[PDB]
């Protein structure tokens, strides 16, 4: 019978493949034909921020476009703000090895975690004027890879135990659990209508989940090898992601499939990150190869460079206004742009 | 603009605060040497020193080691995290299982991000290893074709009483590690190899010794003198 | 879709000889050193042999050195294990298996009970 399943899943994948070859008209560069290219975009260093003892290892910026937060695998958590380059917080961490952070939406809150395999939730506005572990949200069995708010009360997370979950920070508890990938899951991006959010997994899946009803509406699968990186893009209705096969790819979630590949057989290094600006029309991406690309979401030239880093490109992020780009690296400095 | 100066007054005062904590955490952090410990499940990791963490000290160095227990099988992501270790703690029972520790050893080894760490390898359990070629069918001949072409280094050293086909067997299984290291090291890190059982506490001295090597073959290079 | 499909199978006399074959699709295959591991009935899952992008550098277990050849074709897609002289030891399923990402030589996760760059893999039987 295992065979007799796996046969049906073979026509199943050869069925929902020729759907989506019905709705394949053309792709987006030949619909796009008559837009005005971006030409050359300048970004220069506005702030670099310093602080961190080793690699910076994630990201996120604050609804307000002014502060940011940073983690890093000395076991530091530091809160910046961006326009006096001022540290508003230094949280010390339990397990130095963090590989991720969150902002709340309102600002009440930070969250990150790592190799412990739990989410440590600090709260920045306590009675007591103090940083503190508001909770702790262990129950992943797997580092915990990426995670992010919905409010104060909800954080998705992600984990190398290769699901994702919902937790209410109150219960202390998983809400949902979301276990369809089959590799590590890497990161999550939240729809602007925050009713969806979209994973990439070590696998070349990427998923978009419904946070109701719990599983997933969609499975998209056009990348080649682990996607690190996966962002909306700022409409809700398609998103971009990057992987170790050194393309980025746009999604839709309408057509169910790619529109676009943004490549040069000049890179030949793993994606880390990537967000777009707020129009949609620039997709920011960090590599391996220590700089940021700057991409023509409707076209796939190279509309421009941000390249500061003596090591690797790690985390990446566009202001809420869109007011500025901030990416983090290897090297333990963030660098804004502008 | 008095009410931005009150509020520039508290960033700075916050700021400065935070750079005076920052600073003496610079010197825990630069004070203290971070190690990778890696081995199968046969591997007798857990008493090589005599996330799980094992702090150490050694003629008043610290040495900070982590052994990534409670995570999934396959590791390429995870993995990136130790980029910036002083070593690798990489630990083999000596037995057939030497063919999975040898593929693990190459992927840690070849890895982008792990280029520049060396390893300090510690060939467990080898009274185990002497009692079984001391009696037994010879089978490490069956498991690796090339121990009938091998023979003795001539500047292996023999432990006291060790019988000639035991320093046979020690030193083949210790030098095909050698072998992997050295097709690519590049100078730019090296392998440390030790013979060990579960009764040694010299191995907290060796792991001191190996990291001197390694931060003096990284400032020998940093001088153009490797 | 990255997806490797392997053939050649079933029983063989001990003695005997077979080609497995591995079809990919979904990636550049060029770009990957590529794997075969196998897997005996109640066993844990072993490394067989490699071949790197060119197919100019290879490598095998012990247990397998000269008696089983791995070689690829870049134009095709398609990578192969030639197998002469089989042992009853030999019984397992074979596994055609990529390294993760493109362009290097370590593959850490080719030999992880789940993996998402294997195929099915297919059935060797060594008996009479």
């Known amino acids: 019978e295992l065979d007799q399943l796996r046969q049906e899943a073979e026509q199943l994948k050869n069925q929902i493949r020729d759907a989506r070859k019905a709705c394949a008209d053309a792709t987006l560069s030949q619909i796009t034909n008559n837009i005005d290219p971006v030409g050359r975009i300048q970004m220069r260093t506005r702030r670099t921020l310093r602080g961190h003892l080793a690699k910076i290892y994630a990201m996120h910026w604050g609804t307000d476009s002014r502060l940011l937060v940073s983690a890093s695998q000395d076991g530091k958590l530091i809160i910046w703000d961006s326009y006096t380059t001022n540290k508003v917080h230094a949280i010390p961490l339990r397990s130095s090895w963090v590989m991720t952070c969150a902002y709340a939406p309102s600002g009440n809150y930070v969250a990150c975690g790592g190799l412990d395999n739990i989410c440590s939730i600090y709260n920045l506005k306590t009675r007591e004027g103090n940083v503190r572990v508001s909770r702790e949200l262990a129950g992943h069995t797997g580092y915990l890879s990426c995670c992010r708010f919905l409010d104060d009360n909800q954080i998705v997370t992600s984990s190398g135990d290769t699901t994702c979950a919902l937790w209410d920070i109150e219960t202390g508890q998983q809400t949902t659990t979301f276990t369809g990938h089959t590799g590590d899951v890497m990161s999550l991006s939240l729809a602007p209508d925050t009713r969806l959010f979209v994973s990439g997994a070590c696998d070349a899946s990427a998923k978009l989940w419904d946070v109701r009803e719990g599983m997933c509406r969609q499975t998209f699968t056009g990348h080649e090898s682990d996607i690190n990186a996966i962002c909306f893009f700022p409409n809700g209705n398609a998103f971009a992601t990057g992987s170790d096969d050194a393309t980025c790819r746009l999604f839709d979630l309408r057509a169910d499939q790619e529109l676009m590949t943004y490549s040069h057989d000049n890179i030949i290094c793993g994606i880390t990150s990537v967000s777009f600006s707020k129009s949609g029309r620039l997709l920011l991406a960090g590599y391996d190869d220590f700089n940021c690309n700057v991409w023509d979401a409707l076209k796939a030239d190279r509309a421009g460079v941000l390249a500061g880093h003596d090591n690797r490109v790690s985390c990446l992020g566009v202001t809420d206004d869109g007011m500025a780009v901030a990416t983090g690296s290897w090297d333990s400095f963030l660098k804004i742009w502008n | 603009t008095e009410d931005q100066r009150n509020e520039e007054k508290a960033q700075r005062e916050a700021n400065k605060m935070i750079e005076k904590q920052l600073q003496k955490d610079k010197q825990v952090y630069r004070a203290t040497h971070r190690l990778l410990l890696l081995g199968a499940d046969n591997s007798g990791k857990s008493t090589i020193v005599k996330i799980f963490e094992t702090k150490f000290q050694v003629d008043k160095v610290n040495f900070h080691m982590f052994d990534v227990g409670a995570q999934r099988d396959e590791r390429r992501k995870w993995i990136q995290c130790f980029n910036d270790v002083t070593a690798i703690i990489f630990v083999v029972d000596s037995s057939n299982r030497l063919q999975e520790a040898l593929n693990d050893f190459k992927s840690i080894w070849n890895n982008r991000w792990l280029r520049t760490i060396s390893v300090i390898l510690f060939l467990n359990k080898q009274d185990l290893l002497a009692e079984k070629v001391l009696a037994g069918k010879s089978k490490i001949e069956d498991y690796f074709p090339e121990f009938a072409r091998y023979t003795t280094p001539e500047d292996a050293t023999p432990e006291p009483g060790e019988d000639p086909r035991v320093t046979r067997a020690k030193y083949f299984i210790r030098d095909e590690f050698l072998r992997i290291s050295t097709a690519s090291g590049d100078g730019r890190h090296y392998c440390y190899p030790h013979f060990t059982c579960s009764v040694d506490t010299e191995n907290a001295r060796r792991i001191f010794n190996d990291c001197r090597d390694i931060i003096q073959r990284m400032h020998l290079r940093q001088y153009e003198l490797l | 879709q990255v997806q490797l499909q392997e053939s050649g199978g079933g029983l063989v006399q001990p003695g005997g000889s077979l080609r497995l074959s591995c079809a990919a699709s979904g990636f550049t295959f060029s770009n990957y050193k590529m794997n075969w591991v196998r897997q005996a009935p109640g066993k844990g899952l072993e490394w067989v042999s490699d071949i790197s992008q060119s197919g100019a550098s290879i490598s095998y277990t012990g247990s397998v050195k000269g008696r089983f050849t791995i070689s690829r074709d870049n134009a095709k897609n398609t990578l192969y294990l030639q197998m002469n002289s089989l042992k009853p030891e030999d019984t397992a399923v074979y596994y055609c298996?990529?390294?993760?990402?493109?362009?290097?030589?370590?593959?850490?996760?080719?030999?992880?009970?789940?993996?998402?760059?294997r195929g099915q893999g297919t059935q060797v039987t060594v008996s009479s």
């Open positions: 298996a990529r390294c993760p990402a493109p362009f290097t030589r370590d593959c850490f996760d080719v030999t992880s009970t789940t993996y998402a760059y």
